[PDB]
Design an enzyme around this catalytic site. Structure first.
Site, PDB file in Angstrom:
ATOM      1  N   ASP A  39      41.105  40.978  38.631  1.00 39.21           N
ATOM      2  CA  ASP A  39      40.601  40.721  37.300  1.00 39.21           C
ATOM      3  C   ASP A  39      39.442  39.721  37.336  1.00 39.21           C
ATOM      4  O   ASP A  39      39.646  38.501  37.290  1.00 39.21           O
ATOM      5  CB  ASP A  39      41.746  40.218  36.423  1.00 39.21           C
ATOM      6  CG  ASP A  39      41.380  40.144  34.939  1.00 39.21           C
ATOM      7  OD1 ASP A  39      40.192  40.262  34.564  1.00 39.21           O
ATOM      8  OD2 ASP A  39      42.313  39.951  34.134  1.00 39.21           O
ATOM      9  N   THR A  40      38.227  40.264  37.425  1.00 33.72           N
ATOM     10  CA  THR A  40      36.996  39.474  37.527  1.00 33.72           C
ATOM     11  C   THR A  40      36.705  38.681  36.248  1.00 33.72           C
ATOM     12  O   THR A  40      36.024  37.672  36.300  1.00 33.72           O
ATOM     13  CB  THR A  40      35.792  40.353  37.910  1.00 33.72           C
ATOM     14  OG1 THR A  40      35.659  41.438  36.976  1.00 33.72           O
ATOM     15  CG2 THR A  40      35.938  40.912  39.360  1.00 33.72           C
ATOM     16  N   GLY A  41      37.266  39.129  35.122  1.00 37.15           N
ATOM     17  CA  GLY A  41      37.193  38.428  33.840  1.00 37.15           C
ATOM     18  C   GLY A  41      38.174  37.272  33.640  1.00 37.15           C
ATOM     19  O   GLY A  41      38.087  36.555  32.635  1.00 37.15           O
TER      20      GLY A  41
END
Ligand SMILES: Cc1c(O)cccc1C(=O)N[C@@H](CSc1ccccc1)[C@H](O)CN1C[C@H]2CCCC[C@H]2C[C@H]1C(=O)NC(C)(C)C
Lengths: 99, 99
Positions: B25-27
């Site tokens: 999850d890059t966010g």
């Protein structure tokens, strides 16, 4: 472009004539934009975060320029604190994770 | 491994002797795990997402085995609907975005 993850992966976007900054977000199924003026018809929609739920306006077949790559998809607009480019649009600009 | 984004980027983790699936999850700035038993001391914390905030337990210097890559870092435990591997741990497994 390769992008490491030491800072938030923020990119420039152009949507509805406007320049915005947005988060490349592999955890988001959907693209969610802060309050803005988009032209055209929309549908009511609710989406879930960590979190709880927010009410958004759903917009289909929107042109969006992501880091100089053009992509068409569904964009959601509502009370999100940060502009999120989710996977529906990430797949359109050939975005992959590598580890 | 390279990973496209047509499906949720789900990986296997070993944490506290247990096997789980988790979203890369890059966010997410933080790693957030569904309620589980982790040994040792913790701090109270609040984290914000879309929809609002959740109360989490903060655990420092936790060993996590992400897709057969060993990493140590802060893990958060609380009522998240999905296990999230955030950037604090993504940088530890040499995770990059490519487009
Ligand atoms: C926006 C969105 C969709 O349109 C569809 C599905 C999920 C989400 C969604 O909210 N995803 C989030 C992970 S939390 C999560 C919860 C359930 C499933 C998957 C992920 C984002 O990837 C990350 N998300 C991006 C961003 C969202 C608005 C608030 C500020 C950040 C907060 C951050 C976040 O939540 N951080 C935590 C540390 C609390 C995990």
């Amino acid at each position: 472009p390769q992008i490491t993850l030491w800072q938030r992966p923020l990119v420039t976007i152009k949507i509805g004539g406007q320049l915005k900054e947005a988060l490349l977000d592999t955890g988001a199924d959907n693209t969610v934009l802060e309050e803005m003026s988009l032209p055209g018809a929309w549908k009511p929609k609710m989406i879930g975060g960590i979190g709880g739920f927010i009410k958004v306006r759903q917009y289909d077949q929107i042109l969006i320029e992501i880091c100089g790559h053009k992509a068409i998809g569904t964009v959601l607009v509502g009370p999100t604190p940060v502009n999120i480019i989710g996977r529906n649009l990430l797949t359109q600009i050939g975005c992959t994770l590598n580890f």
